[PDB]
Amino acid sequence: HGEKSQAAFMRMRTIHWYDLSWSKEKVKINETVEIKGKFHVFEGWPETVDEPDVAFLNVGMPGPVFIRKESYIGGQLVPRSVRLEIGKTYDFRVVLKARRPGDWHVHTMMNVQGGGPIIGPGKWITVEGSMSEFRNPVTTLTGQTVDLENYNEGNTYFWHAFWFAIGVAWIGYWSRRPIFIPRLLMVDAGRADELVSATDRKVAMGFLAATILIVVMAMSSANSKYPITIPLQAGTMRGMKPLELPAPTVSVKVEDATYRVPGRAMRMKLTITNHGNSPIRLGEFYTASVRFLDSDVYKDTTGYPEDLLAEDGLSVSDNSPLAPGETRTVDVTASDAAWEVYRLSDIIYDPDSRFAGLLFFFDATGNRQVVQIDAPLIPSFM
């Protein structure tokens, strides 16, 4: 829910999420929903954002309405921050367990150490049941199975209440006698040296000795119980395995790209050159979580969120099949209400009027190619 407020150009050129899939749309408490897909780190990473040398695969949700059971970059679990390489494509997978009933907008996001959150597309997921049914069991290496919902809760409550009671007892011992005005007047009028007299010093010595003794004894007792402990596990994980994508056989040059102010459309002129040996057709333009589709070429069957999906939002002046070896120039219009709803038109406010996106080309046999485009985006007012 944090997008629509970030700069449009930086939403356009940080990270491109595609091939997203959600295993379920409606789940019960304790059930699992799996979010998969790929993300590409844009080569033209903005200078105001630190390079993703330390990045965390996070989930966008209103608090722990789900718990993150697992998360993978590549094929390996990533509970710590990771190092990503600019220009690479990674596949990810997040496993969530439903915890709180309701309708939640779940995003896949990436946090960068020096640039803030990069929020991917959000999908509404319904959770049914009761929060009282949620369980989070975990088996330790010491041979004990505990529930993370309430483990150590009583011990924490007890120790905090005990020390609070000790402090309250100290203050109350001193508060049985008159507190402020008589003591102030006694300290002012000559030496006081009467408001603190034995056995006050004995009581203070007892409090100090009892505090130190209780701390030492409690530490020793908490070492006998739980004799095996480890420090908090932390540290960025290098060696994230990226996807080894084949080199695209389509080359696209953005010769001038504009947009109307005001308006809900973006227009660009592309020179597409088709290498390889199969006729291709432009089927999709993805800019920032928004997919503009040409319905005559490609249809979405993955249940992409409807507000981010423009089924016929991509119009190509000449979208006839492009024979191999042939190059042509077309005018491409990406038009949808999403362009204004997600404030992609707010790029006119940005200090860097440049866009980036992904074009998906499909051949007759159905196999698709991903090409990346970026160009200056010029507003037009007249």
């Binding site: 829910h1 944090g2 629509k4 209103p62 803030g116 008589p182 102030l184 009028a189």
Partner: protein, 236 residues
Amino acid sequence: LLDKKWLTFALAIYTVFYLWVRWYEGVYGWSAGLDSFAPEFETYWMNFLYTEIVLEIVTASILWGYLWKTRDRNLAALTPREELRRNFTHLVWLVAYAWAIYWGASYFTEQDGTWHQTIVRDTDFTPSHIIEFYLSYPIYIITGFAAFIYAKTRLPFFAKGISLPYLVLVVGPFMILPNVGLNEWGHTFWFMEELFVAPLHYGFVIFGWLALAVMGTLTQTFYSFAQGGLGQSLCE
């Protein structure tokens, strides 16, 4: 008579109003309050902001102005019993100020913290900013200014001069309210991380220290209490 039941009202009004506010934000936090660009947010929280700002300005004007016009011109001809009653009324004002300071600087401030680890900010006017920056901070500012004005206009001890600890106690905690400019600037251009210990937040900290002038203020009020009605009993 001396200390009357204005103290019960002073505690209860803040308690009841802030419990209602907490219920309101617990109901409209999610579901009209997560998305700042939705039209339901504009009616459930932007309207809240506008109404609370207007009411705060009007209430501050009325309260401070009334306290100032009803100021005591003949402070010399004030009986010690009346001075004791006025000192207790000032202590009730200080109690209300302390309660408002608690609600603003501890409860809703750390509540903004809970929200900082659950959402991604969409603006400077998130549901928690409406309640913490623009409701509770102005409320305790109004209460503190009213307490200072009451002391200056009814207590002879606090007349004939502006008390330095009282001025610090009243103005420093106020300075947290313009320190919100540092917060938003320190979150947008500076530190994109939701760190709650970042130097961008030391502006609240520096002027949160100025509330330690409550000690000088309280010894001044103790001396004002012990002017004619010091006893006897005390020191005997």
